[PDB]
Structures are given as C-alpha cells and as structure tokens.
C-alpha cells in the first residue's frame, strides 16, 4: 500500500504531439507567438534558470551537492526532542548513574 491519491498528486502531463515522432521535420508550433492557442501543436521549451541571485527567490542545491556532506548517519538532539522511555534512555545516552 502507498499514500497519496492520484487526483491530489500532480496531474500527469499531456501526451506529446505525434508530429515530434516523425524524425525529422520542423514541427510548427505557437512558440513564435506568446500566448496559448487551441490549434497548432504544443512546443517544448528548454529549462530556464535565472542568472543573478535573489534573496527571496533562491533555489538551494540538492541534498547531496553541498560544501560539506558526511555519509555517517549522525543524530542531533534539541529541546523539542521528546524522548520515549525517559530516564533510562538519557542514562544510556549519557553513560552516568541515577
């Protein structure tokens, strides 16, 4: 079993036009214009990326590409961390005596 309903998930993209499957001519599309049109096949734009940086509009790198990334599955503790057992878990993690 898996969570996430298909209707709630991102809608599947439309099927690619059959004109692109004819290697290889110039598929006429509305890319020349600047608005959606029913007729005329759909174009395929390239991946656009902004040059300069913007504070509010900034996309961080992936989880792996970082200035420092360790493979050891480390663990950190903070105030919000609510332990399960309680005293015994803290004693084990600290190596002390009660």
């Amino acid at each position: 079993y898996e969570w996430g309903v298909r209707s709630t998930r991102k809608s599947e993209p439309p099927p690619l036009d059959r004109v692109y499957e004819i290697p290889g001519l110039e598929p006429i599309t509305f890319a020349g214009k600047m608005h959606f049109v029913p007729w005329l096949a759909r174009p395929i734009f390239p991946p656009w990326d902004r040059g300069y940086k913007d504070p509010r509009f900034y996309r961080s790198p992936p989880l792996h590409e970082h200035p420092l990334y360790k493979d050891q599955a480390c663990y950190i503790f903070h105030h919000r961390c609510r332990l399960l057992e309680g005293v015994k878990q803290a004693l084990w993690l600290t190596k002390t005596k009660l």
Partner: protein
Amino acid sequence: DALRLLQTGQERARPGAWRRDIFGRIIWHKFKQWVIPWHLNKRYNRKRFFALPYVDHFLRLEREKRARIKARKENLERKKAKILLKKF
C-alpha cells in the same frame, strides 16, 4: 521618435503586437513587462487569445449594425443635400 528611428527604425516607443482576444476584434495587445518568461507564468497563461468559431455570428451582427449605421448616415447626408437644393 527621431532618435529611435535613427537608432533602430522601430515605430512606437512602447513595444507591442497585434493579437486576437475572445471577442475576435483585432486589438493592439499592450506589453506589461515581466521578470519571468511567458512559458511558465501562471497568470499570463490564463490570459488566452482566441475567439473560437461561434463568435462569427456576433461579429457578423456587429458588421451588419455598422453597415446599417453607415447607410443611415449616407441617406441622412443625401436628404440634407436634397433639402438644401430644394431651398435654392
């Protein structure tokens, strides 16, 4: 305007282009200037530009109304000229 014509030969300072809206009447679409391209802007994508065929009936009706107004004005001018000639 002279400087622009001698620098690039482009008419009208503000850029633009002709487009067809829902009503079908050829309107001179005005550019709003954006930061992101047009192939991903959510708002601009909603502003479609097509009139569809069924609007042809309304277009014909508008053309007929305009022709009727023009014929009425022409007959009006003709009657005015006739009355002026009759007066003299």
